[PDB]
A paper describes a structure:
We studied the disaggregase ClpB, which contains tandem ATPase domains (AAA1, AAA2) and shifts between low and high ATPase and threading activities. ClpB is composed of tandem AAA domains (AAA1, AAA2), an N-terminal domain (NTD), and a coiled-coil regulatory M-domain, which forms a repressive belt surrounding the AAA1 ring (Carroni et al., 2014, Heuck et al., 2016, Oguchi et al., 2012). Each AAA domain extends a flexible pore loop bearing a conserved aromatic residue, in most cases a tyrosine, which interacts with the backbone of the threading polypeptide.
These states were termed WT-1, WT-2A, and WT-2B and populated to 15%, 43%, and 20%, respectively. Substrate engagement by ClpB-WT causes full enclosure of the AAA1 ring by all M-domains in a constrained, horizontal conformation. Cryo-EM structures of substrate-bound ClpB-WT show a more restricted range of movement than ClpB-K476C, altered intra- and inter-ring subunit coupling, and fewer active nucleotide sites, providing a rationale for lower activity. Ordered cycling of AAA domains between different activity states and a large rearrangement of the AAA2 seam subunit and its pore loop are not observed in ClpB-WT.
Residue numbers in the entry:
A (entry chain A): 159 to 287, 293 to 407, 409 to 430, 441 to 858
B (entry chain B): 529 to 858
C (entry chain B): 397 to 407, 409 to 430, 441 to 462
D (entry chain F): 265 to 287, 293 to 330
E (entry chain F): 159 to 198
C-alpha cells in the first residue's frame, strides 16, 4: 500500500495542529478551490519567485479543510504530499520506478477521488532518468488524479513551459510577492507562533520596523521570508543571550581568580574579598535564577493557554457547545491577566537583561547581515556626524564648502530624510588637481562607512571609446563576457553601500553621461544579463578640472556663488545641460595657501611616524625642514603631488639609506634636524 | 446559476491579468477620476493628460485596434517636465506601484548590437536559454505598460525592432516563440526639439508647435518610423504656479515621510514664496526647484533632527528666517 | 467559470458576510456581558436565517 | 531512533553530499526528519559540494 | 536497541577524554547555536 509507504498526510499534521494559520491570499485559495472542483484537468500549479511559502498556502488550504471553510465538494478529502524523489529509491532496474508510480495510481483509483494529491517542486517530475509525465498524463487529462502543483517560476519556464503537454495539464496561479501590510499581518501571526516557540517576548513595533527595513533595503531574499528569518535570528540571538550571563561570568572569573590566589597563599583580607565577591556572584546568580523561574512560569502558563486554545478548537471542529462556553469563560481572561501579571513582574525584575527584542536588536542583526550601519543615530556615530566636518578636517585641509555639502548629503541620508529614489548624492567635483579629491572620497568612506578602501575607482581617461562604455555596463548577450557580468555592476551588488569614483570624466568620450543619466536619475541599472541592480543607497562622484585655470585666477576675491555659476556655465559648454540638470550637487575646489601644504605635510609626518613606530622608531623633527619642504613641493598646476614626491625623494630614500647603513636604533630620540639643503637624523 | 459573458471576462482577467471585464461603475468613476488624478500628480502638461486619457479610453471601452498595440507615443519636451513621472503616475494608478512597468533604459544602446539585450540571443550563441529581458517581462505581465526612456541617445536604427512592435507587435523572440503586444502600450520620451520648444513655446499654437518639431524629428528618425506612432505629443516648459504646485506635492510627500518619522510639520507660505522665488529658470525646468527644496529645507531640518530639537507631537511650522527657513517647536 | 458559479452558489457571499456580522455582534454582546444589542443580534440573525432558508 | 529520543539527540553528518549521493538514497528520507524536526544535524563540506548538491536542490538550500 | 548498532558517540569520546580541545572559533560555535535554537 504505497500511500502508506511513501506519502504523508498533511491533514493528519494539521489535525495535530502542527502548522501555520497562514493569513491572506484568499482569492488565490478560492481560485485553487475552483480549479480543483472542476470535472476535467483538476490540477493547478503554484508559481512565483521563492520565499513566498506556497508550501504554506497548501498547508492553509488543508487547515481550512480541517476547519470546513471550503465548499461542499471537498469536505472529507485527503490532502497528501509526495516527493518525486521519494520514488527514486532504487533507480537501476527496469520499470521499478514505474511500478511504484502505477501502484500509487491504483491506490488513488481505489480511494475514489476523496484524496487530493500534493506535489512540491513539480519540475522534479520532468526528468527522472519516458520517465514520469508519460504515466501521469492519462489521469491528468482525465482529472481522476487530484494533483496540486507548487514550484518556482524559473523552473516553470525552464522545464515545464518548454514541454507543452505538461503545460496544458496545468493552470497558472500566480502568487504575488506580498505587500507590506500583508507581511505585517502575517508577522503578527508569526509573533504569536514564535512567542509560543522561542520562550521570549517580541516588540511588535520592532516587528513592523523589521518588516519595513527588510522590504526597504535587502533585495537578496524576498517577501516575507527575509523578515521571517530575521525575526527568527533575533529571537534565537536573544535566546542564547538569556543564558549568556555576562556579568555572572565576570563575577565567576573574579571569584575563581581570588580562589586561586588564596590557595596560592595557603594580613590577609583576600578571604574577605573572596567572600564579598562570592556573595555578589551568588546574589546575581540568584536574581538570574529568579528571572529564569519567572520566564519559565510565563512560558509554561502561555503553553497552558495555548493548549486551552487547542482544546477549544477541538470543540470548534467537533461541535460541543457548552464546552466552548466553559473553556472560554473560565480559561481565557484569568490566564490572560496573570500572563500580563507575569509580564509586568518581568518588567520589574529583568535587569540582567531582557526577554524582548527591540528595533535596535533588529538593526544589530541587520548590520550583521548587511554590514551597513542603519543601527540608528545613537549619539556616538550621530555626534560623529555632528562633528563630521571636523572629522574630515583631520585630513581635509581648507575647502570647507564641499565638506559642508558632503556632510549635508550624509545627514540627509542617515537621518532617513532623503527621497531615496535618486541616489544619496550626485556630485561634480571641480577645482585644482592634486588637492585630495581622492583623499576626500577616502575620508568620506573612512569616517562615514568603512575605510579608505571600500570603494570603486574608475579612471575615465581610458573611456574614450564606445567599447569602453560596453565594458563598464556589461556586454550584450550572445557575446563574450556575458557569462561574467559587467565591470561595475557585480562589484556593486557585492558591496551594496559604497561610494563610486568616476574621476576625470572630461578625458572620456561624451557618451558615458547617458549611462550616468540612467543612474543619476534613477539609481538602477540594467546589465548585460537583463537584470537591474540598485544604486540608490550609494554615492556617485565625478571630478573635473577644466576652468581650474579660471578658479586659480578668480578664487582670489570672488564669491562662492557666482564662481559656481560661471563654472556651471562652463560645464554647460562641456556637458549636456540635460545631464547636469540631473546632477544634484556641485562644488568648486579652490587653490590652497602654503599653510595648507604645511598641514598636509604634517599629516604625512604623522603617517610617517606611524610607519616608523611600526618599524619601531621614535622620530621627531626640526620644522625648519618642514618649511623647506613647503618651499619645495609646490607647483601652481599640480600642488601637492610635488610635495608627495619630494617627501619620497628626500625622506623615504635617505632615511632608509641611513637605517640600512645601520645608523638608526629603534627607541632612540631621532630628531630630523635640518641640513643646508637636506635633513639630518640624530641618535639620541 | 446562469453563466454570463461578464463571468467569462472576469475569469479571463483573474486567469491572465489582462483587465478584460465589462466596465463596472467603480472603474468608470475611477477613470473619470484618473483624468482628474493625472491632473493631480502631474501638474502641467494637460496635452499628455488628454492623450493618455484617450489611450486608456480606447483600451477599456474595447474599440481600438486588435492589430496595433494600444497606444504609441513619442514624447517631446525639455528636461524634467515630468515625463518619467507621468508614466509612473500611470502605473501607480493602474498597477498601484511604479514597479509594474517595463522600464528599458534606452541609452545603453549607443552602439547597435546590444539589441540582443532585448530580444534574446540567436541560437548557438550565449543567451539562448535566457531570452532577452523585454520578452520575458512582457510574457509574465501581459497587461503592462512599457516605457522606453530617453530613446534617441542610442544608435539610430535600433527601432526596426520597434517597427515590428508598433506595426503588429508579435515579436519573434530569440528562441522562436511569439511575443504579442496587443494588450500593451509603448511610450517613448525624447528631448530633441526642446531648445526650439523653450524658444517657441511662445508665439505658436499647439499645432504649429507639433508641425515644426515633427519636421525636426523626421529629420532625426526615419520616415518609416514616424508613421507608426499614434500621437507625437509635445510638452511645455512650466510656469510658476506649476512650480508652486510641484513644491506643494513634494512637501506633501515630505510630510508623509516625516510623519512616518512621526513629526507634525507645518510651513510658512512665505517660505513657499521664497522657494518659488528660488526655483525658477526656464532653461532647466523642475529640478532647480527640487534640489533647492532639498538643500534649503532638509539640511537645517536634518541638522536640527540630529540636534534632537525635534520633539514629536509638536507642530513644526517651517517659518522663514530672513532668507532661510527655521523649524519651530511649539 | 462553471465551477466558479458552482462555488458562488455553494458559498453564499452576502449570507456569509451577514454571518460575519452576526458573529461579530455576538462577540460584542458577550464583551458587554440596557442592552438592545441583543435585539439587533436577533434581527440580524433572523435576516441571516431567512436568507439561509431561501438559500 | 529520531522519533524515540524526541530531539534530545542531534546527530552529526559530515559530507552532506554523501548523504545527497548515497545510492533519498539517504537524504530525502531525512529531509522529512530535518523538516519536521526530529533532527537538526550539522553539515560539513566545501563550497563546491554546496553549489553542487546543496544549492542545486533549492529545498535542500 | 538500534541505537548502538549504527551510531558513534563523539560526546562519549570527549566524555572519556579521547579528543582535542581546539582553541577559539567561539563566535562561529555561537552563530551555530544561533542556528540551532531557531524554529526554522
Ligand atoms: N501566511 C503565512 N503564515 C505563516 N507562515 C507563512 C505564511 N506564508 C509563508 N510563510 C512561511 O514562509 C516560509 C517560506 O515560504 P515557502 O512557501 O516555503 O517558500 P516557497 O516559495 O514555497 O518555496 P519553498 O520550496 O516552499 S522554500 C514557509 O515555510 C512558511 O513558514
Ligand atoms: N507637471 C508635473 N507634475 C509633477 N512633477 C513634475 C511635473 N513637471 C515636472 N515634474 C518633476 O520633474 C521631474 C521629471 O523627472 P523626469 O521625467 O525623469 O525628467 P524628464 O521628464 O525625464 O526630463 P528629461 O528630458 O528626461 S531630463 C520630476 O522630479 C518630477 O517630479
Ligand atoms: N584636504 C586634504 N586633506 C588631506 N590631504 C590632502 C588634502 N588635499 C590634498 N591632499 C594631498 O593632495 C594629493 C592629491 O591627490 P589626488 O586626490 O589624486 O589629487 P587631486 O586632489 O588633484 O585629484 C594627495 O596625494 C594628498 O597628499
Ligand atoms: N583544537 C583542536 N583539538 C584537537 N584536534 C584538532 C584541533 N584542531 C584541529 N584538530 C585536528 O585536525 C584534524 C582536522 O580534521 P577535521 O577538522 O575533522 O577535518 P575538516 O576540517 O574537514 O572537518 C582533526 O582530525 C583534528 O583531530
Amino acid at each position: 500500500q504505497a500511500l502508506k509507504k511513501y506519502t504523508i498526510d498533511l491533514t493528519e499534521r494539521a489535525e495535530q495542529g502542527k502548522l501555520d494559520p497562514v493569513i491572506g491570499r484568499d482569492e488565490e485559495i478560492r481560485r485553487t478551490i475552483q480549479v480543483l472542483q472542476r470535472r476535467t484537468k483538476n490540477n493547478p500549479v503554484l508559481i512565483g519567485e521563492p520565499g513566498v511559502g506556497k508550501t504554506a498556502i497548501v498547508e492553509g488550504l488543508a487547515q481550512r479543510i480541517i476547519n470546513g471553510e471550503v465548499p461542499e465538494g471537498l469536505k472529507g478529502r485527503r490532502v497528501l504530499a509526495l516527493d518525486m524523489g521519494a520514488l527514486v529509491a532504487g533507480a537501476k532496474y527496469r520499470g521499478e520506478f514505474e511500478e511504484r508510480l502505477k501502484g500509487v495510481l491504483n491506490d488513488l483509483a481505489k480511494q475514489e477521488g476523496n484524496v487530493i494529491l500534493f506535489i512540491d517542486a513539480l519540475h522534479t517530475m520532468v526528468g527522472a532518468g519516458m520517465d514520469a509525465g508519460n504515466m501521469l498524463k492519462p489521469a491528468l487529462a482525465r482529472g481522476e488524479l487530484h494533483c496540486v502543483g507548487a514550484t518556482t517560476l524559473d523552473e516553470y519556464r525552464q522545464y515545464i513551459e518548454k514541454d507543452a503537454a505538461l503545460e496544458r495539464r496545468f493552470q497558472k496561479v500566480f502568487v504575488a510577492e506580498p505587500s507590506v501590510e500583508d507581511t505585517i499581518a502575517i508577522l503578527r501571526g508569526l509573533k504569536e507562533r514564535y512567542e509560543l516557540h522561542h520562550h521570549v517576548q517580541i516588540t511588535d513595533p520592532a516587528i513592523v520596523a523589521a518588516a519595513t527595513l527588510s522590504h526597504r533595503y535587502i533585495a537578496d531574499r524576498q517577501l516575507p521570508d527575509k523578515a521571517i528569518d530575521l525575526i527568527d535570528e533575533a529571537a534565537s540571538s536573544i535566546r542564547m543571550q538569556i543564558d549568556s550571563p555576562e556579568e555572572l561570568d565576570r563575577l565567576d572569573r573574579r571569584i575563581i581568580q581570588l580562589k586561586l590566589e588564596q590557595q596560592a597563599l595557603m594580613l590577609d583580607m583576600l578571604n574577605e574579598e573572596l567572600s564579598d565577591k562570592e556573595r555578589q556572584y551568588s546574589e546575581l546568580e540568584e536574581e538570574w535564577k529568579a528571572e529564569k523561574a519567572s520566564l519559565s512560569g510565563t512560558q509554561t502558563i502561555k503553553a497552558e493557554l495555548e493548549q486551552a486554545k487547542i482544546a477549544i478548537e477541538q470543540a470548534r471542529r467537533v461541535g460541543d457547545l457548552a464546552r466552548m462556553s466553559e473553556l472560554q469563560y473560565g480559561k481565557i481572561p484569568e490566564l490572560e491577566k496573570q500572563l500580563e501579571a507575569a509580564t509586568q513582574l518581568e518588567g520589574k525584575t529583568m535587569r540582567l537583561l531582557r526577554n524582548k527584542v527591540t528595533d535596535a536588536e533588529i538593526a544589530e542583526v541587520l548590520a550583521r547581515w548587511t554590514g551597513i550601519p542603519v543601527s540608528r543615530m545613537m549619539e556616538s556615530e550621530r555626534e560623529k556626524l555632528l562633528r563630521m566636518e571636523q572629522e574630515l578636517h583631520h585630513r581635509v585641509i581648507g575647502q570647507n564648502e564641499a565638506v559642508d555639502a558632503v556632510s549635508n548629503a550624509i545627514r540627509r541620508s542617515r537621518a532617513g530624510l532623503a527621497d531615496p529614489n535618486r541616489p544619496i548624492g550626485s556630485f561634480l567635483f571641480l577645482g585644482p588637481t592634486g588637492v585630495g579629491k581622492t583623499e576626500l572620497c577616502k575620508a568620506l568612506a573612512n569616517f562615514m562607512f568603512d575605510s579608505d578602501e571600500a570603494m570603486v575607482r574608475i579612471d575615465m581617461s581610458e573611456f574614450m571609446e564606445k567599447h569602453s562604455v560596453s565594458r563598464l555596463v556589461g556586454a550584450p548577450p550572445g557575446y563574450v563576457g556575458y557569462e561574467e557580468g559587467g565591470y561595475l555592476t557585480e562589484a556593486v551588488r557585492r558591496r551594496p553601500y559604497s561610494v563610486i569614483l568616476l574621476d576625470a570624466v572630461e578625458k572620456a568620450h561624451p557618451d558615458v553621461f547617458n549611462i550616468l543619466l540612467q543612474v543619476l536619475d534613477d539609481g538602477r541599472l540594467t546589465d548585460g544579463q537583463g537584470r537591474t541592480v540598485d544604486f540608490r543607497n550609494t554615492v556617485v562622484i565625478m571630478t573635473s578640472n577644466l576652468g581650474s585655470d579660471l578658479i586659480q585666477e578668480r578664487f582670489g576675491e570672488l564669491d562662492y556663488a557666482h564662481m559656481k555659476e560661471l563654472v556651471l556655465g562652463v560645464v554647460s559648454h562641456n556637458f549636456r545641460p540635460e545631464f547636469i540638470n540631473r546632477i544634484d550637487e556641485v562644488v568648486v575646489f579652490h587653490p590652497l595657501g602654503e599653510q595648507h601644504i604645511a598641514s598636509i605635510a604634517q599629516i604625512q609626518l604623522k603617517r610617517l611616524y606611524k610607519r616608523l613606530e611600526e618599524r619601531g622608531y621614535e622620530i621627531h623633527i626640526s620644522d625648519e625642514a618642514l618649511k623647506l619642504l613647503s618651499e619645495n613641493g609646490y607647483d601652481p598646476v599640480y600642488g601637492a603631488r610635488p610635495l608627495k614626491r619630494a617627501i619620497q625623494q628626500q625622506i623615504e630614500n635617505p632615511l632608509a639609506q641611513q637605517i640600512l647603513s645601520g645608523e638608526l636604533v629603534p627607541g632612540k630620540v631621532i630628531r630630523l634636524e635640518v641640513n643646508e639643503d637636506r635633513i639630518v637624523a640624530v641618535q639620541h
